[PDB]
Amino acid sequence: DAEFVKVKFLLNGEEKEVDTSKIRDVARQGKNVKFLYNDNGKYGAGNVDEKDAPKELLDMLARAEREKK
Amino acid sequence: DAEFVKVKFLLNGEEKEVDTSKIRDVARQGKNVKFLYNDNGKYGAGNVDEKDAPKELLDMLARAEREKK
Amino acid sequence: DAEFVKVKFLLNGEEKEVDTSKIRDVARQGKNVKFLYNDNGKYGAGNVDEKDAPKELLDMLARAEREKK
Amino acid sequence: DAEFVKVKFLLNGEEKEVDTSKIRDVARQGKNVKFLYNDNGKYGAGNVDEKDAPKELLDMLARAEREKK
Amino acid sequence: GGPSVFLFPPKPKDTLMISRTPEVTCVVVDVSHEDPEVKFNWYVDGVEVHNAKTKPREEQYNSTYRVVSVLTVLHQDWLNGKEYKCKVSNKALPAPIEKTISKAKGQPREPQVYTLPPSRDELTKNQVSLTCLVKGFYPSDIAVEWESNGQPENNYKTTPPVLDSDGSFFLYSKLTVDKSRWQQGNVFSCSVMHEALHNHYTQKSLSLS
Amino acid sequence: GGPSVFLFPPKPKDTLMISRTPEVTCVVVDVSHEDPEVKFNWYVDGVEVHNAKTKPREEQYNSTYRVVSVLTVLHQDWLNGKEYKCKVSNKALPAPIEKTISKAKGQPREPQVYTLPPSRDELTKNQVSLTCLVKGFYPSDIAVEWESNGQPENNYKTTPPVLDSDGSFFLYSKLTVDKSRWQQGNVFSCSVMHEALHNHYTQKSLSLS
Amino acid sequence: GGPSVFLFPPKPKDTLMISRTPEVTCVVVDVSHEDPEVKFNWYVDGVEVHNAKTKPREEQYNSTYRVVSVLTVLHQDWLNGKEYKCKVSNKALPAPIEKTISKAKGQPREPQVYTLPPSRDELTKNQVSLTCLVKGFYPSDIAVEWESNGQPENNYKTTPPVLDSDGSFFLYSKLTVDKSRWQQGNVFSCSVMHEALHNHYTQKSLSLS
Amino acid sequence: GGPSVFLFPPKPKDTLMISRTPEVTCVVVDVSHEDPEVKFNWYVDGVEVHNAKTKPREEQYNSTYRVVSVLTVLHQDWLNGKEYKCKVSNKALPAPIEKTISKAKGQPREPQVYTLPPSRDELTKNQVSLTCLVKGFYPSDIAVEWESNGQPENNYKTTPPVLDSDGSFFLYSKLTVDKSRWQQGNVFSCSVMHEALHNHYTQKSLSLS
């Protein structure tokens, strides 16, 4: 089921993009989804409006609200 | 090292917080840990759910159940 | 045991006599030595002129002036 | 359901005596068998010449040399 | 007059342990069977409180009664030196009775706990006296118990507290034990509980060595 | 409610020393200006006695009076357990008041006097606590003083007597002294006086060793 | 010897969840009334940062104070192994104090989570011990909780991490539960959270049958 | 305060075996070459003792020394909970150092020793983890070793003791062994030594059946 969907986001105005599989944690702040990720070996954070979020990221978020707490 | 563990609790809806070192006695009532404390010269009491109780408070509680009796 | 001095005195004109060993306290009033005694189990008092006092009673008196005071 | 055995020894010149069942460890030093014991809640130590040592104490000693090491 | 009224403070151990319930107790004696109506009103610094409980009337030989109210209190209220009033209102007494009780005012002071062994001279006896001195503490409210080998030793008496020359308190406690036990070499412990101790609790031990 | 009457025993040291005068004292309180005259009648096993004296009136709060009679007694009378009644007769009271006082009933029992030195832990302080245990005595009436080098030491406190489990009494006395003095190596003595002692008097000493 | 400074890492669960706020805490102890004012400067790889906060003074037994700064940090900063310096500046100290803290250096390593059921011998008791082994992980920063039926089980204790012979860490966690519950056949789960786990999170379950 | 002082209790196995010598050890570090005289005074419940030994100076690269005193003790002294003080007397610091160490107070409690086999999931590895739980013991001082076929197995680590909810202690010990050996069907044993065990010693075994 090798998923590998991408999440596009803005970092310092620059339009970055990271794989779903590199995302370690997701969290919601209204219609804003934050996410911590691990790209190759370095850790970074990223925002996205929910409208601009792939549904897999929102699936991840739900799963995490259940699991992590 | 030797920490300053603080215990957060609710008093008349106000969210108070007291150091462990000011706590004179602890006791458990179900899931609920009570504790008497002495804050700079005034005595007060406080509750906490066991889930919300730090290790050190629970250590104190155990020690007291052994010792005081 | 090893004292048995008797002190003779007047009680209601009647001439009583009590053992030294039954005397609990002695006191001097001029040439008059008073003494409280415990005869078998009942307490009594008695006078004697110093001339009529055995030396042991006067020894007791000195000891008591030192001790009791 | 059976017998017991006491070990006689000298403590500060006083002749103490302790049951084998209160003995926690035994050890040999030459002709001299030492033993640590626990008498109703206080711990004490005791010597005995091997000649003056009961069979059961020497049995204990052997068992310990095997087991503890 | 007629009846008579007493007001007792909570047990010292109950104000120091959050596990326990301290109480102030009002006792009224010599209440008339002709009108045995007793009314209790409880005040905590003026403020009326309606959590008290009155144990039912209880009669003696004289068919005169004795009624007792029980006001459970908060540890910290007592200890912060709040005042507990009881207005007792009978018929027999011309005018209701007002009594107030409270912890002793003054900066709290930590007890010094020292155990003392038996006198040499006492050893000629069958029982000997294990002694504990508690000194320099304020206020006087205190608890003191003895134990050995993780079990209560109950053959002791403690003196009342005594006002010392510096305005602190001292008392002595005396546990009596068969000279056999002292002489074997067992260990005895005096537990002291006071507001001015860390953990409201300390302990000191004593043995023939 | 009217007046009230109290009746106090002689000083323990005054019944034991023929050199001194023991006295029983009657205190009457809450005597008002409405009827201020009080009358005293003293009885020694029924028999009326006319050697009492009444100290002049004194006022309290309430502008009530307080009147005090003082009956000098015989050592041996008190000690043989005679009874001292005082009939107090104010107008205010429907009937005169009769109170009786006397030495405590029971076989006398000799005090055991043991001195205890300071705890090792106490030595870290400036002052140290020299202790005296008095045990197993009856009745409770007793005197206790301290001295050193044949001179009074006054910095002591003695507990009340305490009822022991065998129905005898014990107390402790505590003299406080600068650790300097204890450590030099001086000698301190506790004098105890009781009816059940030979000479009504005994003494025990204490020094650093 | 003037004050003293200590520096504590964020809570392990706070660096792994973007929903939560990790913080580094500087604790400064033995600040006296003689000079009670302490200054804080925070550096993240040299760069000064002005988002710290200093909780008010707190005084202790020694009449010394203790002051605490709280620097909220970024998850990814901490985890990428940035360095947090705190320059503490009292006058008392000849020169201000510099302390530095940071995540433990070394290749991260994934925890292996294995649950172990009670010993057969333990079944004779009323409570039984559900065990979880976490092994071969780096760095030591880790979180561990228990749950059943989608609800927290809170009656557990976890050991400190322990350095293994290969330079990784292990710990054990122990949940205690009435043998009734274990024997019915309920399911218990140990949740482990670590940087080296997929999703910063894993879980392992355990049940009677 | 230039130097620094540490005080270590005896090894748990040395207080439990009369065959061995327990010792309390005082370690003093950062002693000045300029002021190198260190004085040690040892006290056993106050009482000075003159059997200590001070190992000769040991100097580092730092040209500071480290000096170590060794007070051999009696098993029963330690175990009956006597107190060991060391007065360290530094020229450099104008204030001598006083440290005291002693066994933990409280009713002793017997360890429950249960061995746990590897998790099924762990069997996919080359090495497997044989586990031993020691639970409900007091005080924490304890020894724990492993062996097989009458020979020491040294590839284990034990956790520190951990305070349990009932105020006892628990730890886990972990022996690691090639899955080959576990699977053949050899037997392994965990030896536990504690004051509260009969013979100060017990043993529990573990094998693939």
Numbering used by the authors:
A (entry chain R), B (entry chain T), C (entry chain U), D (entry chain S): -2 to 66
E (entry chain C), F (entry chain D), G (entry chain A), H (entry chain B): 236 to 444
What text appears in the publication on this structure?
In the present crystal structure, the homodimeric Fc fragment appeared tightly associated with two molecules of the optimized affitin C3A24, which both bind to the linker region connecting its CH2 and CH3 domains. The symmetry‐related interface of each affitin molecule is formed by three β‐strands (β3, β4, and β5), consistent with the positional randomization strategy that led to the selection of Sac7d‐C3 —and also in agreement with some previously published or crystallized affitins directed against PulD, CelD, or lysozyme as well as the green fluorescent protein, GFP. Surprisingly, it appeared that the affitin binding site almost entirely overlaps with those of protein A, protein G, and FcRn. Overall, the interaction between the affitin and the Fc fragment is stabilized by a network of hydrogen bonds that arise from six residues in the engineered binding protein. Among those, Tyr40 makes the most significant contributions: both its backbone carbonyl oxygen and amide nitrogen form hydrogen bonds with the side chain carboxamide group of Asn315 in recFc, while its phenolic hydroxyl group forms a hydrogen bond with the main chain amide group of His435. On the other hand, the C‐terminal residues of C3A24 are involved in dense contacts with recFc. In the present case, however, Lys65 of C3A24 forms two hydrogen bonds, one via its main chain carbonyl oxygen with the ε‐amino group of Lys248 in the Fc fragment and another one via its ε‐amino group with the backbone carbonyl oxygen of Asn434 there. Furthermore, it seems that the tentatively modeled residue Lys66, despite its low electron density, contributes a salt bridge via its C‐terminal carboxylate group with the ε‐amino group of Lys248 in recFc. Indeed, the small Ala side chain snugly fits between the two nearest residues in recFc, Ile253, and Ser254.
